[PDB]
């Protein structure tokens, strides 16, 4: 993956990041979809990634994982559909704040992986989606590491896993 995630010769960095970000959104959207039946208001009253990491709605104001993830994923899809942020027409340049928006998108998608690994790994294994989860996460992480798109603090919840995959 180290090579596949590298910027192709002559390829535009923003376009490269844009195309891959869409792919990552689709993969995590698919993976979370497989376990939504098990991520409920009762199972996850607060958005967390294990006993050591929790994600507040505002800060503190907390909310369930399903509500948190649905809002986060809806927001990402809206950004992908924003022609001013992710131009699809030829000649239209990416906005000046594109890199910043892309990093925010990736930092947020990471939290979905974190939640699934920490709170629903049992369902992943039962659905035999373990290999799929690991493969998509590895691609995601290798890409972010290649361009240093996610700060070290954000990655804390899956640091142990990150090292093993490396």
């Amino acid at each position: 993956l180290r090579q596949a995630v590298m910027l192709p010769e002559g390829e535009d960095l923003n376009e490269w990041i844009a195309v891959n970000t869409v792919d990552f959104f689709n993969q995590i959207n698919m993976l979370y979809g497989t376990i939504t039946e098990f991520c409920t208001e009762a199972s996850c009253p607060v958005m967390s990634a294990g006993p050591r990491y929790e994600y507040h709605w505002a800060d503190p104001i907390k909310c369930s994982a399903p509500k948190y993830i649905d809002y986060l994923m809806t927001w990402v899809q809206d950004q992908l559909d924003d022609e001013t942020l992710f131009p699809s027409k030829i000649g239209v340049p990416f906005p000046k704040n594109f890199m910043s928006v892309a990093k925010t998108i990736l930092k947020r998608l990471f939290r979905v992986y974190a939640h699934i690994y920490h709170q629903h790994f049992d369902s992943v294994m039962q659905l035999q989606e373990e290999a799929h989860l690991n493969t998509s996460f590895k691609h995601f992480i290798f890409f972010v590491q290649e361009f240093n798109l996610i700060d070290r603090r954000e990655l804390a919840p899956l640091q142990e896993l990150i090292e093993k995959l490396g």
Partner: peptide
């Protein structure tokens, strides 16, 4: 705003 993670109580 979806702020950065925090250590739970």
């Amino acid at each position: 705003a979806l702020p950065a993670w925090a250590r739970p109580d």
